[PDB]
Amino acid sequence: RMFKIEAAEIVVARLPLKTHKVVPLLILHGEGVQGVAEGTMEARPMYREETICGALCLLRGTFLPAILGQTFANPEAVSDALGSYRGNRMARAMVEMAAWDLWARTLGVPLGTLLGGHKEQVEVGVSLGIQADEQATVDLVRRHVEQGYRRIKLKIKPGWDVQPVRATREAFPDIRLTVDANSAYTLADAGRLRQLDEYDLTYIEQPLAWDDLVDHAELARRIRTPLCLDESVASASDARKALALGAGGVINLKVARVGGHAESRRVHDVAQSFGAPVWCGGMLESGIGRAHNIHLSTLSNFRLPGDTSSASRYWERDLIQEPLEAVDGLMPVPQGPGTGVTLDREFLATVTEAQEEHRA
Amino acid sequence: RMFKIEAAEIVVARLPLKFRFETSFGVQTHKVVPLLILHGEGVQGVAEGTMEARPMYREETICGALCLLRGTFLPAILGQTFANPEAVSDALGSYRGNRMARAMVEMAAWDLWARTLGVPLGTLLGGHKEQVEVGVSLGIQADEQATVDLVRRHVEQGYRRIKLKIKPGWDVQPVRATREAFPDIRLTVDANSAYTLADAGRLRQLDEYDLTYIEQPLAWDDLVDHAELARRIRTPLCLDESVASASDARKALALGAGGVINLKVARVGGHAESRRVHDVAQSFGAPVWCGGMLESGIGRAHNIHLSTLSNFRLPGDTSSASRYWERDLIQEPLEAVDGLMPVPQGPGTGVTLDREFLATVTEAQEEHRA
Amino acid sequence: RMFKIEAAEIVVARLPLKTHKVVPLLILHGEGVQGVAEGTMEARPMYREETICGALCLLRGTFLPAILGQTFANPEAVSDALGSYRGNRMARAMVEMAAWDLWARTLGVPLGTLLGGHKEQVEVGVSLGIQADEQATVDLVRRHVEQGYRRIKLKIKPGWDVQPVRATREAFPDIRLTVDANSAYTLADAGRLRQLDEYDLTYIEQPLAWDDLVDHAELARRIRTPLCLDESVASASDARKALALGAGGVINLKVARVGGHAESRRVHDVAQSFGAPVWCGGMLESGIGRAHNIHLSTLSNFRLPGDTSSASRYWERDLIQEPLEAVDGLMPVPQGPGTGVTLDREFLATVTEAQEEHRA
Amino acid sequence: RMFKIEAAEIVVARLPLKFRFETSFGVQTHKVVPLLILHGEGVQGVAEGTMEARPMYREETICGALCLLRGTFLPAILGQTFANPEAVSDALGSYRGNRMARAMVEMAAWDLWARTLGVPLGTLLGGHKEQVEVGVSLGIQADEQATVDLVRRHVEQGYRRIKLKIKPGWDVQPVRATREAFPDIRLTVDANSAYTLADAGRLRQLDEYDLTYIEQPLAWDDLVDHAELARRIRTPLCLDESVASASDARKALALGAGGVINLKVARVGGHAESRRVHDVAQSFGAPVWCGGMLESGIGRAHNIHLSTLSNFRLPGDTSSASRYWERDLIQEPLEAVDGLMPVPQGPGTGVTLDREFLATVTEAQEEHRA
């Protein structure tokens, strides 16, 4: 039956990379269980508009006081209890996703199962930064093809796009190959991107402005490579508009970016209704975040590999007890109720920069 | 955790109606109710099929659906173990069409799954309304005024929308007389896909009587003509028959074929696909409302639970069971007061077969096992 | 003058292939003659929505009781006597096509002549399944080019499309070559299908969903090869919509799929009014069905070869007395009133699994 | 089985009219009737040509058509054997235009073929109505009121549509006075291609008088301007002159140049092509109706038989022969009561030349042989 949110902890961690990374966590306590979720906003607004400082204000000033001590039928009811506030989808995702975790756990059901997925494993890809020259790009691609990754993503930028891609396709005629245009382009560049079409990329990711759909739709008419939207799809209706304007053919789906699991299933379902695929984006998540992504990825319109590769690629040691390791490009769904992972409270303590508990 | 479908009953019943339901495709005075009961994990899931004896509203038949259940769907799931209702649906291969047949299996599985968890069906689907707004659809009328009297009767019960079944040679009159006597109600017409683009003039001045929508004026399988008609009139169009899937809903809305969808859970292949239709509509800014097929309390209760989702923004066809049946097939009454229908309490549908009463109106019954 | 339908037989046959095939037949008796038609629905709904079990219910429960003992001016009058029922075009085609056969026979006129055709022979093509590799595809194509077939159709699927087609066109630069994409594709694949354009295929058949027109219209804008619609054209207005949306340029016309001869002539005429060709699809028909198809194919907008090849390709022995054998890619129209063929009642008896007669 | 065209007569007759037919392209008080009679297999087929002495309604002339018949079409078919009317049509080479000339040959062949089979023409074409709804078109009026009196006269006979021939400087007045006295009839205007896009204002407020359509307001050969005018007004447009083939019909409807087609059998080149026009329109959801050209009973009877097809959903111009002729060229009367015209009984057209009477109104006559 229903659930009472009794308490909430905010823990801010400074987690060392394999130079640290600040990881905000929300823990929601109720019915003898807890749900845990990870904030993916940055210290400064670089990938998008939200920041850690601004999100925590909203959490402890508005969102938490709205739900603490209330009783809820499902996580959708929890999201609704905060519907009058604009944007801040990543802040809201912290509450929403912890609630899914919590809800799934009062039921004894894995999270992906509840969302309607039934994959036990999910295909993963790897992303590659800009390298010094062509053969260094090919050498690093060759390494990752051999590890079994099922899609290779190249970061490109004007003056360095056709060359790395030509070199790679030449060495690797058949692999699934994509590029990240990282909003580095303008419509002026359409001729430079037309040159990528003969290399049969699965898609080009967000070539133009992060908040644009209209110009992408225009660029899509000028090149044959499908466009993939990332930062400009913050909701189901963004997804609907993007696909209907022809701004892209593929969506990079980041769960916190669109406000959590329920909106994400919506985006996934809208995309599917247009026969467009989604795939799971990543944001250097700790195991909390990584585990949420994997569970969402089990949904059936996730037909392209996702950025939920091995935790060991990123961390010396993760905040959770479970290792999340991909093998031959497949990531197993962590077993258990909810996310199927468990915070290591003693280790987290050693890397906690700040924490607080709010009650009733 | 996971569930094993151990056995299945098909039970076909017949219930005398209480009113005479006249539609553009004919008059109906009784109703045949095919039930599928799924058994596993010490509970059961029950679903009602909405296909007809003959293909009048749409393409499926009870006869065609049953042998598909017997020879294909049931053999594919009996003795199998599933993580969720979507996995059950997945196991019914790539068979084309036959959405209502699939819906019987899919919806029974949702009821069984929820009962294993002990949660209301609607809650699992993401809805959190405790009650749902309802209107009434009223069949075709003997005369130009027996219409208004059947109307008054319903405006007085607080039904939140009045829907008039209409027909070629009987459409502007019944609405005329109705908007005459009740100038301010939410009012709409069905129009059972009985028209063509030809009749666009005839349907144009219905623009006057401020209807919330006109429901399925053109071919049951059309989207493109509807898009054109939408451009030749002010009253929004509502699609019923035309939308049998979430991609159908997407095309309809992308084309501008309607601005409203009548979502019938079994027509689209069940709860998951109805939730997708609902989400797709929402994403276009188009509301849905819950259509009805004169269901017994099994179907009506599945409907009520789906209707708890937040894009069900207009009143549905889910009125009081006592309007239809001297005695329903379930123990609980499903009654609306003031145009609100409360969500039947309990796990899954929150309703229960009256096995004793059902036995006396049963005319066919089989048991299938692993 | 007019005609009274006095009786109707349903015969269900189990006909051995050259593993059997179930063949439902309807025989309509009136005015001292009979008309015979063949159901092309399957045991399970795989090519489309209808099944043998569901069609026979409709026949013996609804359609037959509606026409038995009535008098009719033409087959259009017969179809009309069942107009209030939705879909089930193949079930309806059984009644409609037998009625054409019956009507044509009370007149002493060949069926194609009545429909307005005047070809005495019709060009035929051959369809090829997926083969193991390129040269096995080319060897089998070479065989069929030599037998005189006038169009070659390859089944393709993602990962096996450009290779068989490249190999074939290379060996056979000038033959009429088409592919069956068997609804195996998505809009995501438009780049893979663009790659077929340089091989000058006459058309690509139904690449996307079986019930879609809108997405096909979209795909048609992305490739140069004409699209051919099959399962998504169930009527004259489907045909009109398909050609008007630009969903395709060619229609695969299957007579039972659209409800029989009269609707088919409509589809043929609508297509023609858009200057688009039709061609005769096939469904592994016995000689009854094969004979109906050949008569319809004699119409003048059937400008591409049809799948009404030799009966001996499919059956040890056919249900009819007449051999239907193509020679050098040409199939002669069977001589006689109506379909110009005759059931072998003694042989059919040996392979009858069920039969029944309904009267007045 | 097959038929041999053994011989052919061309007979040109002239019949005094009974009313004066004023159109935008002039007034008509007599009518010249070119007949073609085909002979084979001990029966005959008769067709009436609808081209004029001078090219006023459209481009063909009786003179031009006859020498085309003499020097080309007839030589191509005489002594030949054909399976059906479509084969006859096929044998008339690739000659461009001249649809009415072709129609004389094609329609005579349909009448002969049907008679060889002993079946009604309409039955062979797929029609199964036993009677057909008809309206009347009324010529241009002396005054703003001699209009209404000629109208009343016709509303009283139960004609199912009233059609007013109109003209530049005489259009809103005649309709004004008519809709004044008869507020609820089906009413429409012809408008003989006498306007241009300029006059869109003048034709706009005709929107008011609820006409089912406005017939051919712009150029006789135009589709594109009509499409534009259709977007500047509410009343549906009807095309006549513009549609001379099934691809013309397809373009007109794809462009949105009209929502209704006046199907004139001889204008489009005969029965087969008229059946294609009809089917194409149906496929767009657009109705047709049977236009008329003041035909003798030969033409009127071909018209009635074509009109039995099911997309002839609006009343045609096929009124009673006694409105036109003191004495018709055939033995049978073609009379409508209450706006219904019964299908003349018999094989083919079901009508018969009165050879004796025709002889006295004949002014030209030839015989051509194999």
Side-chain angles (χ1 to χ4, degrees), chain A residues 73-74 76 113 117 240 269 273, chain B residues 83-84 123 127 250 275-276 283:
Chain A
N74 44 215
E76 285 83 354
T113 296
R240 179 276 289 192
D269 289 348
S273 83
Chain B
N84 49 27
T123 301
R250 177 273 294 191
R275 200 207 52 231
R276 298 163 198 134
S283 85

Side-chain angles (χ1 to χ4, degrees), chain C residues 1-2 73-74 76-77 80 103 107-109 112-118 236-237 240 244 265-266 269-270 273-275, chain D residues 1 83-84 86-87 90 113 117-119 122-128 130 246-247 250 254 275-276 279-280 283-285:
Chain C
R1 50 189 83 121
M2 307 212 180
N74 44 215
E76 285 83 354
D80 182 45
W103 170 234
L107 294 189
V109 194
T113 296
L114 272 193
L115 295 185
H118 46 90
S237 68
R240 179 276 289 192
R265 185 170 62 182
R266 286 167 207 139
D269 289 348
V270 163
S273 83
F274 277 91
Chain D
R1 57 161 307 100
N84 49 27
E86 291 83 358
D90 182 68
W113 160 240
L117 294 183
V119 184
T123 301
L124 274 188
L125 295 166
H128 48 81
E130 288 165 350
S247 67
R250 177 273 294 191
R275 200 207 52 231
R276 298 163 198 134
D279 296 349
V280 160
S283 85
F284 275 88

